[PDB]
């Protein structure tokens, strides 16, 4: 868990710049330099400002403390000072100070414009800093400043709380959290600024400061600094959490029970013989949602859904997931119930979702939300509209609540995967977190305010439509055919007269580790992946993956991305090399298995294709000429009702796609049982 490491003292002296650009109107620059360290947020150094020079000579020196176990990036930048306007940046450079070695002085020229700097790392004689680390994420050492009371402004730069301010005059107190390695001060004021220094890595003392009013009875403060009492609310690790491991035992015995019947087995399976079976699903909006319902149906009817330990999806797939898991026994109960729900809501027209009655109720909820501590973003609006499109109404269900669906191992564990600004964030009812960083919190706390792995303020867990918006977000970070160009105006006009920190805030990285205004996101990564990263989280050990793919072009892209993703992490994974025949007309089910590979999971892949459903009404059964229509599913050409934009499906069109999907899995029963048998010997 813990790591003791001494800091080094880095002195950087800013010498000169050369060839600095002029400001407009034949005005020479009045330049100064700003220094900022990435690992000392809120702390700035600034040189003296020189006047009318393209070749300023500052020769100023500054001192930082540097933790060598952390990645440290020095930002140094040159501004042109202006008495009236905000200053214009004319030069910026980011420098990794790993290069600088202790003892060795190092002269650098950063580059027409140039900046000369000298660096000196020196050993120091402080106590070592106490770090908490993961070997990729590092929590720096935190101290707390405590202030008692007997128009007060307390400023402590570098702290989570920047400034604090009570109005009272009776027995108030305040807490400041800040890194122990910072060299900073506390400033107080009711004129005159009283300042107390806070030297780095030192044991704090009791301090009494009287702060003068103007010019009336002064105020007395008691100050003391100590290591922060709180424990870490963020879990740092690359192992599965206890709840997931417990669940795995519960779930493995219903899978054992299910397998025995499905495979007509000789004896009962012990826990360590149960093969881990996962569902992996891509995005694709409404098309993915409905097609996935069809897939689950097939798995239920074949008695194979009970054999599945893990259920992962992206974007549209999570819509199917979120609803089903609203019911704690969805996998045991009949699926045709939830299908009807989805179908009916999908057929319902979405004109009213943009009616000022609902728009009123959205903004009136955003304002309520905004009065609470909540940044307001388009994604939170998207949450409300999507909730309205998907249901008729507010749905009072929450991710933490889906634990109910796992108490007795009665459903698979759901893994909602999100790609954020790129990092993969995995959501489950037990925990939410960054796969890369191995940093997780329980879903109740997702959205709450954090600092250095510590819970600062508990916000109430939000309604699941707000997480769904994250997962299916379609919208450009800066909003600033003819169908959905008019709800844009209706929304804009209705919302006129109207910044997002996450649970890693404060944490740091271990060392050894001309027109484009866009309405939507456009990176291919947002639309072309599948939920592989959840299937390859360190502890999961997957034996068989059922890969459902909802792309209309490129049925193998997401698998090829997954091959790359694994290749780059040294994870066993079969090779996806489909023949030209397989590209042109794929079929219902493709096995990718490398017994050339070893402990690689077995992979059954299900492209979204028509193929043999054209002339079969059900598995094996030929299609009558009376149900010819039933097998004509409009997957291509114009007026394809299953395009990514479309959020209204005629019940008829819903049914073709659902039944097609059901059929593709059902008709592949043999391959699935084959692969299930194979996953048995491979597990042992
Ligand atoms: P996932 O598979 C999610 C795919 C989501 C597609 C959703 C389609 C939405 C159309 C409705 C949009 C609402 C309009 C909002 C206002 C925008 C215009 C404002 C000027 O990810 C790949
Ligand atoms: Ba000037
Ligand atoms: Ba200015
Ligand atoms: Ba106290």
Curated annotation (Swiss-Prot):
Q: Which domain of life is it from?
A: Eukaryota
List positions binding Ca(2+) 2: 24, 80, 82, 88
Q: Do you know which Gene3D superfamilies this protein is assigned to?
A: C2 domain, Cytosolic phospholipase A2 catalytic domain
Cellular component (GO) terms are: cytosol; membrane
Q: Does the keyword Ligase apply?
A: no
Could you tell me which residue ranges the C2 domain spans? 1-110
- Record-level Gene Ontology MF annotations: calcium ion binding; calcium-dependent phospholipase A2 activity; calcium-dependent phospholipid binding; phospholipase A1 activity
Which positions in this protein are listed as binding substrate? 284-285
Query: Which BP terms from GO are recorded?
Result: fatty acid metabolic process; glycerophospholipid catabolic process; phosphatidylglycerol acyl-chain remodeling; phosphatidylinositol acyl-chain remodeling
Where, by tissue, is this protein expressed? Expressed in stratified squamous epithelia, such as those in skin and cervix, but not in other tissues. Strongly expressed in the upper spinous layer of the psoriatic epidermis, expressed weakly and discontinuously in atopic dermatitis and mycosis fungoides, and not detected in the epidermis of normal skin.
- What is the protein name stated in its UniProt record? Cytosolic phospholipase A2 delta
